[PDB]
Design an enzyme around this catalytic site. Structure first.
Site, PDB file in Angstrom:
ATOM      1  N   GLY A 113     -32.655  -4.962 -53.104  1.00  0.00           N
ATOM      2  CA  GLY A 113     -32.292  -5.171 -51.708  1.00  0.00           C
ATOM      3  C   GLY A 113     -33.480  -4.902 -50.790  1.00  0.00           C
ATOM      4  O   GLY A 113     -33.323  -4.489 -49.634  1.00  0.00           O
ATOM      5  N   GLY A 114     -34.683  -5.121 -51.309  1.00  0.00           N
ATOM      6  CA  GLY A 114     -35.885  -5.012 -50.496  1.00  0.00           C
ATOM      7  C   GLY A 114     -36.167  -3.616 -49.971  1.00  0.00           C
ATOM      8  O   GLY A 114     -36.930  -3.470 -49.015  1.00  0.00           O
ATOM      9  N   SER A 195     -35.026  -6.852 -58.727  1.00  0.00           N
ATOM     10  CA  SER A 195     -35.737  -6.972 -57.458  1.00  0.00           C
ATOM     11  C   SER A 195     -36.360  -5.627 -57.068  1.00  0.00           C
ATOM     12  O   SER A 195     -37.160  -5.081 -57.831  1.00  0.00           O
ATOM     13  CB  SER A 195     -34.809  -7.512 -56.367  1.00  0.00           C
ATOM     14  OG  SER A 195     -35.506  -8.396 -55.505  1.00  0.00           O
ATOM     15  N   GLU A 322     -36.629 -18.268 -58.297  1.00  0.00           N
ATOM     16  CA  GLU A 322     -36.686 -17.038 -57.494  1.00  0.00           C
ATOM     17  C   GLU A 322     -36.834 -17.296 -55.986  1.00  0.00           C
ATOM     18  O   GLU A 322     -36.249 -16.591 -55.170  1.00  0.00           O
ATOM     19  CB  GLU A 322     -37.867 -16.148 -57.935  1.00  0.00           C
ATOM     20  CG  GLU A 322     -37.822 -15.643 -59.396  1.00  0.00           C
ATOM     21  CD  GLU A 322     -36.805 -14.536 -59.599  1.00  0.00           C
ATOM     22  OE1 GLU A 322     -36.087 -14.178 -58.637  1.00  0.00           O
ATOM     23  OE2 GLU A 322     -36.705 -14.024 -60.733  1.00  0.00           O
ATOM     24  N   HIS A 433     -32.556 -16.157 -57.170  1.00  0.00           N
ATOM     25  CA  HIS A 433     -32.883 -14.727 -57.190  1.00  0.00           C
ATOM     26  C   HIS A 433     -31.606 -13.901 -57.177  1.00  0.00           C
ATOM     27  O   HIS A 433     -30.817 -14.002 -56.233  1.00  0.00           O
ATOM     28  CB  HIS A 433     -33.713 -14.398 -55.942  1.00  0.00           C
ATOM     29  CG  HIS A 433     -34.228 -12.990 -55.896  1.00  0.00           C
ATOM     30  ND1 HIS A 433     -35.141 -12.501 -56.807  1.00  0.00           N
ATOM     31  CD2 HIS A 433     -33.977 -11.976 -55.033  1.00  0.00           C
ATOM     32  CE1 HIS A 433     -35.425 -11.243 -56.511  1.00  0.00           C
ATOM     33  NE2 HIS A 433     -34.735 -10.900 -55.438  1.00  0.00           N
TER      34      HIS A 433
HETATM   35  N1  LIG Z   1     -29.094 -10.127 -50.234  1.00  0.00           N
HETATM   36  C1  LIG Z   1     -29.419 -10.778 -51.400  1.00  0.00           C
HETATM   37  C2  LIG Z   1     -29.849 -10.065 -52.569  1.00  0.00           C
HETATM   38  C3  LIG Z   1     -30.170 -10.828 -53.713  1.00  0.00           C
HETATM   39  N2  LIG Z   1     -30.093 -12.172 -53.768  1.00  0.00           N
HETATM   40  C4  LIG Z   1     -29.683 -12.858 -52.625  1.00  0.00           C
HETATM   41  C5  LIG Z   1     -29.609 -14.292 -52.709  1.00  0.00           C
HETATM   42  C6  LIG Z   1     -29.198 -15.031 -51.615  1.00  0.00           C
HETATM   43  C7  LIG Z   1     -28.859 -14.388 -50.409  1.00  0.00           C
HETATM   44  C8  LIG Z   1     -28.915 -13.027 -50.292  1.00  0.00           C
HETATM   45  C9  LIG Z   1     -29.331 -12.219 -51.418  1.00  0.00           C
HETATM   46  C10 LIG Z   1     -30.635 -10.140 -54.993  1.00  0.00           C
HETATM   47  C11 LIG Z   1     -31.196  -8.728 -54.828  1.00  0.00           C
HETATM   48  C12 LIG Z   1     -30.218  -7.908 -53.994  1.00  0.00           C
HETATM   49  C13 LIG Z   1     -29.955  -8.575 -52.602  1.00  0.00           C
HETATM   50  O1  LIG Z   2     -33.210  -8.851 -50.476  1.00  0.00           O
HETATM   51  C1  LIG Z   2     -34.227  -8.730 -49.730  1.00  0.00           C
HETATM   52  N1  LIG Z   2     -35.644  -8.746 -50.268  1.00  0.00           N
HETATM   53  C2  LIG Z   2     -36.856  -8.622 -49.471  1.00  0.00           C
HETATM   54  C3  LIG Z   2     -37.977  -8.356 -50.461  1.00  0.00           C
HETATM   55  C4  LIG Z   2     -37.423  -8.304 -51.767  1.00  0.00           C
HETATM   56  C5  LIG Z   2     -36.065  -8.896 -51.633  1.00  0.00           C
HETATM   57  C6  LIG Z   2     -35.015  -8.319 -52.678  1.00  0.00           C
HETATM   58  O2  LIG Z   2     -34.059  -9.114 -53.147  1.00  0.00           O
HETATM   59  O3  LIG Z   2     -35.137  -6.965 -53.267  1.00  0.00           O
END
Ligand SMILES: Nc1c2c(nc3ccccc13)CCCC2
Ligand SMILES: O=CN1CCC[C@H]1C(=O)O
Ligand SMILES: *[C@@H]1O[C@H](CO[C@H]2O[C@@H](C)[C@@H](O)[C@@H](O)[C@@H]2O)[C@@H](O[C@@H]2O[C@H](CO)[C@@H](O)[C@H](O)[C@H]2NC(C)=O)[C@H](O)[C@H]1NC(C)=O
Ligand SMILES: *[C@@H]1O[C@H](CO[C@H]2O[C@@H](C)[C@@H](O)[C@@H](O)[C@@H]2O)[C@@H](O[C@@H]2O[C@H](CO)[C@@H](O)[C@H](O)[C@H]2NC(C)=O)[C@H](O)[C@H]1NC(C)=O
Ligand SMILES: *[C@@H]1O[C@H](CO)[C@@H](O)[C@H](O)[C@H]1NC(C)=O
Ligand SMILES: *[C@@H]1O[C@H](CO)[C@@H](O)[C@H](O)[C@H]1NC(C)=O
Ligand SMILES: *[C@@H]1O[C@H](CO)[C@@H](O)[C@H](O)[C@H]1NC(C)=O
Ligand SMILES: *[C@@H]1O[C@H](CO)[C@@H](O)[C@H](O)[C@H]1NC(C)=O
Ligand SMILES: C[C@@H]1O[C@@H](O)[C@@H](O)[C@H](O)[C@@H]1O
Ligand SMILES: [Cl-]
Ligand SMILES: [Cl-]
Length: 524
Positions: A113-114, A195, A322, A433
């Site tokens: 989740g970044g 991620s 991805e 992704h």
């Molecule tokens: N919010 C998202 C997350 C992930 N994939 C996504 C794909 C599409 C839209 C939102 C997303 C994978 C990693 C966790 C978060």
């Molecule tokens: O979801 C948001 N983001 C931002 C950077 C990496 C990516 C993720 O899926 O962890």
């Protein structure tokens, strides 16, 4: 069912799964709630309680901004928190086979989740199937995200940085101390994540404080060497100070800044996180891991290059598309609701969106490398997705795997190329992704949930391979005439493709693209 832990008794609940039983303990606390004076600090150790703790429901998710780009749409909303938000969020979950196992291997999940969003209670992270089918124990934890988890003033214990990573570490320690009581083996723990969770996993491989806390590691679509994964000391300072300004907390005693920020309601902090940078992108990570001199002792590229990490086996992989998810969060011409055929001109504007601080020469060189076609209307649409996916996920994952394996350990690499039949996003976005995750956790094993027969079969095998990696360090499926997964070496670079039709051994994934990103692009 009641289990005695070091800090007190916990009660769980029985679940019915595939004509059998799994015991679930949802919402066990593992740290002092980081509130008031504790906000922005490392997690503090837990008290000790005399009564029985009810662990029969998911706990609060940590404070975070939510994705509001597509209200009512399952494709985005499935990733949003499904539990109340609160600073009181330091809790973990445990799934255990019934009957209680004797010395079961343990799998510990770290969500992505970044580093700004996420929670362990999502449907796609439900560990009950793994526990039922492979008789492993599954653990997952909530860790702080955003400024609340990663605000940095290097050297200052009021806000030293990396708090969310220390949350993760404290949970690993909880498992070392308590998991035998649940029938688990503390000497056989495999971390897995996707991620930003996978980036976290790779950083635990580098942190000396985490080395005794786990055995092996699995990295799905992420690694610390990804360009979004580690924030520099320079960036972190400018962002902390920018946050202070936006909230009226600009002071001269840096500790006084922190005090001021502690008196702000979580919503004002969350509101201003997006603006600590002049321009953002859909992949922006405003508050993430830093080199704090505690969890991370030096720049991680240096540690990796010079072989300073836990020597163990790793399993690493990426998905075929991805990059596509990010295109609909800002690139012009794109839409989940049409085929997104863009023009050369739109591709160019797209690069400005994803590479805002890059020189004009830098952007041109991206275009040169990805736009020599052999014509086809979807040329530019596909090029942009590949640009985003190769730069941010695939090339860093491959470079991590090579560098890691050069120090003598077994590594295994996969390329996941199956698009879910239930995918609510349009087919042009392909194998997205985050969409291998439901296969790993064995969701398609439930025949009542719309997946095809072929997908049941694919998930069953994936589940077995992951389980064998955790238990035995070797992700084979030994029983059903399966393709053998060969070790990844820096010379031949063999990898295994995962799909419903034909699993194959291939070599040198994205060789030409990654030479561009890995060798040349870091110079511009
Ligand atoms: N919010 C998202 C997350 C992930 N994939 C996504 C794909 C599409 C839209 C939102 C997303 C994978 C990693 C966790 C978060
Ligand atoms: O979801 C948001 N983001 C931002 C950077 C990496 C990516 C993720 O899926 O962890
Ligand atoms: C380090 O921080 C400064 C602060 O810039 C402001 O930007 C707002 C979005 C918000 O964060 C506010 O709190 C903060 O004071 C950055 O200066 C900005 O740089 C851009 C691009 O160079 C200029 O166009 C702006 O004039 C300037 N902002 C203002 C209005 O003062 C600076 O860029 C940043 N350094 C980086 C990016 O590392
Ligand atoms: C696919 O859709 C995009 C996005 O267009 C949005 O706005 C409305 C037109 C709505 O009907 C819906 O289709 C969608 O949510 C179109 O691209 C462009 O989007 C930008 C966004 O800034 C606008 O500036 C443009 O006006 C818009 N183009 C058009 C036709 O006006 C895109 O054209 C479309 N592509 C197709 C049809 O293949
Ligand atoms: C824990 O749950 C059980 C449910 O039967 C209940 O008896 C007990 O009182 C609960 N403890 C609480 C809510 O403090
Ligand atoms: C589980 O295996 C470990 C070795 O990793 C062994 O030392 C330990 O005693 C075992 N625990 C039980 C109770 O089987
Ligand atoms: C800043 O204020 C704090 C809290 O009162 C104090 O402990 C510290 O000595 C001060 N530091 C500086 C640099 O003046
Ligand atoms: C092996 O194949 C059988 C059918 O012959 C199937 O039922 C079983 O799930 C398979 N096992 C794995 C681990 O894929
Ligand atoms: C390292 C550990 O050693 C012993 C086994 O019971 C565990 O499965 C693991 O292999
Ligand atoms: Cl491909
Ligand atoms: Cl096969």
């Amino acid at each position: 069912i009641i289990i005695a832990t070091k800090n007190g008794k916990v009660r769980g609940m029985q679940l019915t799964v595939f004509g059998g039983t799994v015991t679930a303990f949802l919402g066990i606390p593992y740290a002092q709630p980081p509130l008031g004076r504790l906000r922005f600090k490392k997690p503090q150790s837990l008290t000790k309680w005399s009564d029985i703790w009810n662990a029969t429901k998911y706990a609060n998710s940590c404070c975070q901004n939510i994705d509001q780009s597509f209200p009512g749409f399952h494709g985005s909303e499935m990733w949003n928190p499904n539990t109340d938000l609160s600073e009181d969020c330091l809790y973990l979950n445990v799934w255990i086979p019934a009957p209680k196992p004797k010395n079961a291997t343990v799998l510990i999940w770290i969500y992505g989740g970044g580093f700004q969003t996420g929670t362990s209670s999502l449907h796609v992270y439900d560990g009950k199937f793994l526990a039922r089918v492979e008789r492993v124990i599954v653990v997952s934890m909530n860790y702080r995200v955003g400024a609340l988890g990663f605000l940095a003033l290097p050297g200052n214990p009021e806000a030293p940085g990396n708090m969310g990573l220390f949350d993760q570490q404290l949970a690993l320690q909880w498992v070392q101390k308590n998991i035998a009581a649940f029938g688990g083996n503390p000497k056989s723990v495999t971390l897995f994540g996707e991620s930003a969770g996978a980036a976290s996993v790779s950083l635990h491989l580098l942190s000396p404080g985490s080395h005794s806390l786990f055995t092996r590691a699995i990295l799905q679509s992420g690694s610390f060497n990804a360009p979004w994964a580690v924030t520099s000391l320079y960036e972190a300072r400018n962002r902390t100070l920018n946050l202070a300004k936006l909230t009226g907390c600009s002071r001269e005693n840096e500790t006084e800044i922190i005090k001021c920020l502690r008196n702000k309601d979580p919503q004002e902090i969350l509101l201003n996180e997006a603006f600590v940078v002049p321009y953002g992108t859909p992949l922006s990570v405003n508050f993430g891991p830093t080199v704090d001199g505690d969890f991370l002792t030096d720049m991680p590229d240096i540690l990796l290059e010079l072989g300073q990490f836990k020597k163990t086996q790793i399993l690493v992989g990426v998905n075929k598309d991805e990059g596509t998810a990010f295109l609909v969060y800002g690139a012009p011409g794109f839409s989940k609701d049409n085929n997104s055929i863009i023009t050369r001109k739109e591709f160019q504007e797209g690069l400005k969106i994803f590479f805002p601080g890059v020189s004009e020469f830098g952007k041109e060189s991206i275009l040169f490398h990805y736009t020599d076609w052999v014509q086809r209307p979807e040329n530019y649409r596909e090029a942009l997705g590949d640009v985003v996916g190769d730069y941010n996920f695939i090339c860093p994952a491959l470079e991590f795997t090579k560098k890691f394996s050069e120090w003598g350990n077994n590594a295994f690499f996969y390329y996941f190329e199956h698009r879910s039949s239930k995918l609510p996003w349009p087919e042009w976005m392909g194998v997205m992704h985050g969409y291998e995750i439901e296969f790993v956790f064995g969701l398609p094993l439930e025949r009542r949930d719309q997946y095809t027969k072929a997908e049941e079969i694919l998930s069953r095998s994936i589940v077995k391979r992951w389980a064998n990696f955790a238990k035995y360090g070797n992700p084979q499926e030994t029983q059903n005439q399966s393709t053998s997964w060969p070790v990844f070496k820096s010379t031949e670079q063999k990898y295994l493709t995962l799909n419903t039709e034909s699993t194959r051994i291939m070599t040198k994934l994205r060789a030409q693209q990654c030479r561009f990103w890995t060798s040349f692009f870091p110079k511009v």
